[PDB]
């Protein structure tokens, strides 16, 4: 019970993304609500 | 003028007004009930 190298899969799993229905999302510390779409566009970088 | 007034009124919902955050979700998810009722008061006063 003392260290940095912990064990995953305890209570914070990674789930799939849903579309056409607004849900509550937590994306890197946002905790917002809204719908998702699947529009394809290329403007991101390796760090964005 | 109407558009500028509406935008200025909408931008009032993203101000801390002396609180710790501009979102009630971040306040009601990290602070205990008997103490989290202080920032909501400031937010309500500012919005009113």
Determine the number of helices of chain A (DSSP H or I, runs of at least 4 residues): 0
Biggest sheet statistics of chain A:
2 strands, antiparallel
What would the principal axes of the Cα set say about the shape of chain A? extended
Distance between the termini of chain A: 35 Å
* Radius of gyration based on Cα positions of chain A: 15 Å
What's the helix-strand series of chain A? EE
Number of strands of chain A: 2
Oligomer classification: part of a larger assembly
Of all chain pairs, the largest interface belongs to: A-B, 2 and 4 residues
Helical residue percent of chain A?
under 10%
Strand order of the largest sheet of chain A: 1-2
Structural class by sheet pairing and helices of chain A: mainly beta
Proportion of beta-strand residues of chain A = 5-15%
Protein name (chain B): Spike protein S2'
Function (chain B): Acts as a viral fusion peptide which is unmasked following S2 cleavage occurring upon virus endocytosis.
Describe this protein's structure.
Chain A is mainly β. Helices cover 0% and strands 12% of the residues of chain A. The first copy, chain A, contains no helices and two strands. Chain A has strands at residues 23-25, 32-34. A two-stranded antiparallel sheet of chain A has the order 1-2. In chain A, a hairpin with a 6-residue loop joins β1 (23-25) and β2. The termini of chain A are far apart. Chain A binds chain B through residues 31-32, and chain B through 23, 25-26, 29. It is classed as viral protein. The entry lists the keywords HKU1A, viral protein. The entry is titled "Structure of HCoV-HKU1A spike in the functionally anchored-3up conformation with 3TMPRSS2". Chains A, B: Spike glycoprotein. Organism of A, B: Human coronavirus HKU1 (isolate N1).
